Symmetry: D2
Subunit: 459 residues, 4 copies
Amino acid sequence: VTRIVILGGGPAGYEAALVAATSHPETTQVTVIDCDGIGGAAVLDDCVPSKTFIASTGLRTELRRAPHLGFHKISLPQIHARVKTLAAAQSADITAQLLSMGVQVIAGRGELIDSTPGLARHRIKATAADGSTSEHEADVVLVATGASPRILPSAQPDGERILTWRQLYDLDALPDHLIVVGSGVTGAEFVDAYTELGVPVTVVASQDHVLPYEDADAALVLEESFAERGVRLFKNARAASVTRTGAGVLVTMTDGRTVEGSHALMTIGSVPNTSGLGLERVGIQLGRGNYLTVDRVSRTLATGIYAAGDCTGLLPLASVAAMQGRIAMYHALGEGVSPIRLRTVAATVFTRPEIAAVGVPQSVIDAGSVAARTIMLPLRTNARAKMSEMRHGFVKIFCRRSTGVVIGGVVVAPIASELILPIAVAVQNRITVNELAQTLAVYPSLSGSITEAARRLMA
Amino acid sequence: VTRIVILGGGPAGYEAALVAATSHPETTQVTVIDCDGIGGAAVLDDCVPSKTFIASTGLRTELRRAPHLGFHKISLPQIHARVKTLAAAQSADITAQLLSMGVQVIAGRGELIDSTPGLARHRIKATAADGSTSEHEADVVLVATGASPRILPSAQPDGERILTWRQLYDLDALPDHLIVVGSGVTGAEFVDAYTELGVPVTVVASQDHVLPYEDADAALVLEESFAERGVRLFKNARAASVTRTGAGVLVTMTDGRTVEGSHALMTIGSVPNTSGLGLERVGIQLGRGNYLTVDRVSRTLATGIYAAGDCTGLLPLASVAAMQGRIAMYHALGEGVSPIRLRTVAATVFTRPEIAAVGVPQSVIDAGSVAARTIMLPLRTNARAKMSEMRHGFVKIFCRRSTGVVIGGVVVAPIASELILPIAVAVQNRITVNELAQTLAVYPSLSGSITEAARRLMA
Amino acid sequence: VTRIVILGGGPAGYEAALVAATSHPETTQVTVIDCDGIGGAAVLDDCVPSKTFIASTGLRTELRRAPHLGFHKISLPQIHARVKTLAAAQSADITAQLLSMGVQVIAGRGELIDSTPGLARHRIKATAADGSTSEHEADVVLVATGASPRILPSAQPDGERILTWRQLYDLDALPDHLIVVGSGVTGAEFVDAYTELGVPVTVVASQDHVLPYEDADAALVLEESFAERGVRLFKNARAASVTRTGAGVLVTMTDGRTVEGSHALMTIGSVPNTSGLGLERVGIQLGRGNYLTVDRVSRTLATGIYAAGDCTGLLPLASVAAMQGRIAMYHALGEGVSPIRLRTVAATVFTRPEIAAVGVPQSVIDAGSVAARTIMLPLRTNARAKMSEMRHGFVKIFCRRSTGVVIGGVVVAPIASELILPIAVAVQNRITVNELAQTLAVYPSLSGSITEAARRLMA
Amino acid sequence: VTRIVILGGGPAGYEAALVAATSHPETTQVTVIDCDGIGGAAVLDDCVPSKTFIASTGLRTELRRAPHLGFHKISLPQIHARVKTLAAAQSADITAQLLSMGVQVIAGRGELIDSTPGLARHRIKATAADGSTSEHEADVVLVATGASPRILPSAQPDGERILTWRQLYDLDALPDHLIVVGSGVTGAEFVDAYTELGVPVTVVASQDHVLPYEDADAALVLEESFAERGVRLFKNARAASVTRTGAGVLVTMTDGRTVEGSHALMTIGSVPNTSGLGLERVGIQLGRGNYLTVDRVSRTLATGIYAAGDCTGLLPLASVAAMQGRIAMYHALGEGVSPIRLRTVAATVFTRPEIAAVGVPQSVIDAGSVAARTIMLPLRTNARAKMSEMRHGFVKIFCRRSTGVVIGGVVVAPIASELILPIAVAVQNRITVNELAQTLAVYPSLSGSITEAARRLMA
Ligand SMILES: Cc1cc2nc3c(=O)[nH]c(=O)nc-3n(C[C@H](O)[C@H](O)[C@H](O)COP(=O)(O)OP(=O)(O)OC[C@H]3O[C@@H](n4cnc5c(N)ncnc54)[C@H](O)[C@@H]3O)c2cc1C
Ligand SMILES: Cc1cc2nc3c(=O)[nH]c(=O)nc-3n(C[C@H](O)[C@H](O)[C@H](O)COP(=O)(O)OP(=O)(O)OC[C@H]3O[C@@H](n4cnc5c(N)ncnc54)[C@H](O)[C@@H]3O)c2cc1C
Ligand SMILES: Cc1cc2nc3c(=O)[nH]c(=O)nc-3n(C[C@H](O)[C@H](O)[C@H](O)COP(=O)(O)OP(=O)(O)OC[C@H]3O[C@@H](n4cnc5c(N)ncnc54)[C@H](O)[C@@H]3O)c2cc1C
Ligand SMILES: Cc1cc2nc3c(=O)[nH]c(=O)nc-3n(C[C@H](O)[C@H](O)[C@H](O)COP(=O)(O)OP(=O)(O)OC[C@H]3O[C@@H](n4cnc5c(N)ncnc54)[C@H](O)[C@@H]3O)c2cc1C
């Protein structure tokens, strides 16, 4: 009976407990210790709440679009009910899954409490919201505590007017004029969301683009998308402060530059939740930025102790958190282990249209660092695209020059988040464009355009 | 120079020409003799249009689902106008590609006119609608004439009340009571589409279900669905005839009972367009079903002569027709060749929800004929599904017992036609559930469930 | 810096160190504490020497086969001198590599001396033959102590007449009548070697054959061979004792009958060198057979503590010992890890001819447990074989029923130990008979038969 | 019943008939028509006779080598008996194989006799040595007639003193001083063979090396080998003439340069046997040099007619002849077809030691045309090498930089012809050095050095 105690039940923590319970039923004993809610911030506060929200926003799009398709009060509070609700329901499903796999699930905060630094088998005191405490022996420990919203002391949030992304679903009415500070992917997604609801938005970006995408082609597509929809924009701006004004907020840059609005949404980074964990008791020193630096097999510098997800700093994606957790267990439980390769991550930006990519960026290729052949197929010639009235979406594919091995791709379409999977497995399993061009994809489908992109790179 | 002449311009033909002219610009001369216009019936008549029609129908589905989301006349002629219009563009895009790729398109009906029956190089005649005629030499000949609606002489279509699916978009008003004769995928799809436009439907099915379907679990999802939305069906009945009554239509079936609707949609099958082609002049004799029996490498029993598409009877899907023309060009132009394997074909029924499958059916695994592990993962626990308010979708993945190689998969969800692709890649490339499980699919998406599906199959 | 201390320097150890120091020059400090000298018994005692001895024997085989080819004193002491001499060089080459790679080699016997039993970092003590002693800290510990000859107290080896295989090269003359006790691979090999030097041999086998062997067809090839060359055997008998007579030796077996030779070679098994290591100080308790039970990832039940080689009892082949040390370094240094699969191990018996096998035995396929296709291709039709005057060699390849993936192979020929490799690659990498069949092996060679073997399995 | 008639039964012809008969038993009818003897020149005159001969030569090597290994009249005619004999026996085995597979086997010369040029089904008149004739209908035709020794009109052979490689086995006594004209692989092999028998040899090379190997390393190994064994050498020499002298031969260069000897062995090229075939009757024009130019799928410019082996000019190796034939049938019979890639050919030079290589040459890599990592492992540190007293053999391996995919290798050892297979399948099936380093090769073996070469390239 090897004991596995996991601090945090978000995706790094939960998907880890799931691999441990499933693969080793009678050999192991898995204990998740989470303070805020199974599914973590991923499910109850950030990722699932933003996507649910964005998803809801869509409707207004397809409504203003029905008359030409032959078919002749937007109440914020209920949209929000759906958000808090679906989020809670996700969390409920996951809590169930864990329980039905023998996973012990405790509500409370965790902390290493090792009597001394060189112990092989560790100890974790779990303190409940119910005041009560409980200690647990652990052969394996996985620190999976996530991150919290970084906060600028010149822009301290309220929940009223200066808001972090978690406070949004607490607003009554749509804002009169939303000011998003911070460009970057999540700042972008909200600019697009609030834009679809009819809310005036002004972005305060660092560089030139409301969102600078490593793939130029797609980035330009969203830029046009934004101008054409009224997004206002401050290029090369750093919020010096965000004070509360008479009726709204006053955002002032470091240039002297200013912009007023009814609300300010702080879309800065996040910070690893890595304090008060006891890491000291076990000899661990947080690396730069306070992340718990981990290796390719998810392990910390102390023995038997693993770390995963946002608290480790690798990549702020729940998918990468899940795999790090999944990996830390395959390693500790003696199974095959394949380190996570940053270039096999599928990442998507949920704007309209979605941008998803996996593999070697086109820049890198256009710099001779990586030889490869490339193709960009415009989705307009595709009949499914046509039925979904897609106008500037395309599929890009990048393969090695000599072998035809798929090494990246970019997709800009309404469901790029799903169309990317196929290219990801190709990159992840050295599949050739020849092999890909061979798969009999469904007609009329957007994915048949993936199949031809590759068919065209054959050589 | 090798002379390629293709009879017929739908997926089989036009995309055999595409491969021909694209990979061998200077060693070939490709001529496509098609009578109805590039894209063939798949694009101009059957496939592209029904999917268009069904996509428009979709809007209604959503729309009145506005309240759950915080929000809150049907003009058939403009839907139809969009149906012809879009069809026309899909056809124009393809013609332009063939044309700029240097393919010689000849609008007309072509036929073989060989002197004796045993020659290497063939001779084809194109007859224009102008009565005019040109003759053409052919080193390689590709018969891609497709199929046509089957017709019951006791229920001859009439364009107004007795309708084939090609005729539906000629109506200027929704039927009062639609009677659909024939259970199958294409009757299933329209019953679903019309039920969504609010039309009453009565099916006269030959089988047990409106949509008989290989995978039981999918079948049920749809059976329960038509039944709730109130679709009426007479199981195991065939229409003895379809007469025209006062203002409606009288359907009479072989058992004597009768039903009455405003219109009757004949949804039987189709017939191969293989007559009057001069296949006699070259020694071929139409096989069972009047089909131009073909190879696994797309060739007929006569040398230099290939066929592909519905006119061969392999499978009536356009995706299969395209690979058949594609593989016939590959075999005739000395390139690498891989025969089509029926169990790699991915196929979807376009209902709401969609149903797609690939590889070994669960039927077989359960009979003991194939040694495999199987899993059925509901989609409702998936956050993305929760967002698209899916409660009955699911992912089924099947795999080899020992090796874990993916051999089949079934997907029932709103975009199954897209998500099936990754599975096909796995099937067509013997990818392993382990291999699939390491792919960092995106979160949150329904495709993440596909990687969990295989993750759990790991052994 | 992570401190690696390896107890024992044979394939398990020295080649765990090699991997250690070669891939992580600056993050590690590798110390190898070995008492007999780098290369261990595999190189200095058992493996390398018998193969050397057998290779010398080979010359005689050939030589008097001079007439068929147009052509046409045995000095045991110089053969033996070549046996020690070559052994010595193999050991010197390895020491030099370890040494220049910066590995700290310490000649001595090492043991665990941990204070309490539950620590992360361990402590080892090396005792020199000088009585001297040094102590060493160990983050990672690798127990690679190998095995020693089993000894029957009623037939204690004496160096002169009662011999273990380690002692054979101490004789200055060929035995008059060699009695070999114990049927097994290592008795089989020596019976063959001595029969070739012209020595009379009488085997007291516990089993049915001198060389009991998994694959029937191979077994026979050798049974017929020993029988023709006149090897004498008492089947199913165990030696009750081995006494020393006048000038020879009296072997008495449990049934009462007796045999008389000049010498007795005890060919029983060996015993794991797992005593006096201080495994108690760390919580381990020797498993069944006094073996240091290990993982599939080479780790013991104590953290930081790994084992590999004969002392674990996985498989007594040096090739298996080396992968065990190799995989223990990979798991401890956070690299990619793939557990050893027993059915990928390739193993050969060094008789004349050689016999090598890999993967599923034909035994199993024939029982119905594994669903496979099999073929046995004699080698005599192969031109190369005709040249090396082989009349009973053959190649057996086994493959998955549906997929055609290679899952086993057996090769009986003069260099089977080399030709088995390609098959192992196929087994270990799920290569397909189709995939193998396209490899342009060389003509003429016996390996061309391997590609035909799979070619015929194609389906 | 598709009819397949093959002109020539060497490896191109025979291995083709074997694939056709085996895969299509009741669908086909296979007819080989060969004039000289099944196995063709490959078996009855060139390749198998030279290897058998070389093999025989070895003995003298290992005899002069026995005294230090502890063991204290070379009649040419019998060595030759073995040669003619084994060659005839090979031929006998193959004739049997064909017969037992339903293949019809006719002795006689073949000729196309097509009534006219555009026939789909061809005709072949077979003329017997027995004067008699016979005609055969053919749906598929495979021209596989091999090549003949090119002959210099200034150096017309005798069979006495000026000899082609086929006349050698007709000599009574070993030559007094053999003069080989022509460097290149086969000229080399004979220099090595006659050298091992004690025969003085003088080579007349074009460039600087008795044999210029694309792999410098190995070439230098043979060069040293030759100087150290007495091979005399004329650098940059072209035989102007080879006249018969008083007692022997007088070879005079174009420089004015001369050298006398007892015999002259003409090792120039060979010429395709492509005359009198009727190729005219079917419209085929021989390409340059009179080769029957074929494509990647083994087909000629006439339909239904395939060509393979030496008569086509691709590569003068029986292995490449076999695959071309094997491929021409897979293509005609509608099976999967994979064109032959010149860079997946394993070629070996049978000298002592053998040189075998497959893949990208090291030159090409050392010219940045191909990025790759490389390694050269000297075989001296290997224990099996040591037992075979190998002194300058090594294993080279070349993998892509980014993926670790094996792309070539060179082996210089006593059985390089067999050790190369494993590297060939790796190159041919994109196997990674990681995968290769994972295969548990047999210890002590030469092939374990292949496994470490790759282990060392991991990254
Ligand atoms: C607005 C926004 C949108 C995003 N959208 C996406 C997206 O579309 N796709 C994607 O892949 N990623 C997305 N991300 C990123 C993704 O949310 C994170 O990568 C992922 O949440 C990190 O998961 P985790 O399991 O490491 O940590 P978390 O999910 O953040 O949770 C760790 C949990 O552990 C608990 N915890 C903390 N300290 C302790 C303690 N001492 N004891 C017990 N429990 C403790 C808490 O309850 C906490 O919820 C988004 C992020 C934001 C902010
Ligand atoms: C209602 C319906 C819905 C469908 N939905 C799907 C779907 O969702 N997905 C899918 O994959 N498949 C679908 N199919 C099937 C798919 O459309 C067919 O498999 C495909 O159309 C066949 O293509 P083809 O190129 O072989 O023939 P076709 O597309 O039928 O066209 C051959 C063309 O050649 C021409 N032609 C005929 N005779 C001659 C001649 N003598 N000379 C010159 N030209 C000639 C015609 O102009 C004709 O249009 C559907 C079918 C129907 C009936
Ligand atoms: C006659 C014979 C023939 C064989 N032929 C083959 C063959 O052809 N192929 C094959 O693959 N295998 C063969 N094997 C088996 C193979 O030799 C073993 O599998 C392999 O030797 C085991 O290697 P190891 O490194 O684990 O241990 P070893 O090679 O046995 O050595 C471990 C070493 O560690 C040392 N040691 C022991 N205790 C301590 C201690 N306390 N501190 C420090 N050092 C210690 C010793 O000096 C010893 O030499 C043969 C075996 C025998 C007996
Ligand atoms: C000295 C020497 C050594 C070699 N060593 C090797 C080696 O080690 N490895 C290797 O791979 N290659 C080697 N080769 C090359 C190899 O021999 C050739 O690649 C191979 O023989 C070609 O085979 P093929 O089947 O195309 O032709 P062939 O084997 O040459 O035979 C064609 C046959 O067809 C017959 N034929 C000709 N015309 C007609 C007709 N009209 N009708 C009927 N039959 C006809 C003849 O009987 C003839 O034998 C060597 C060559 C030489 C000269």
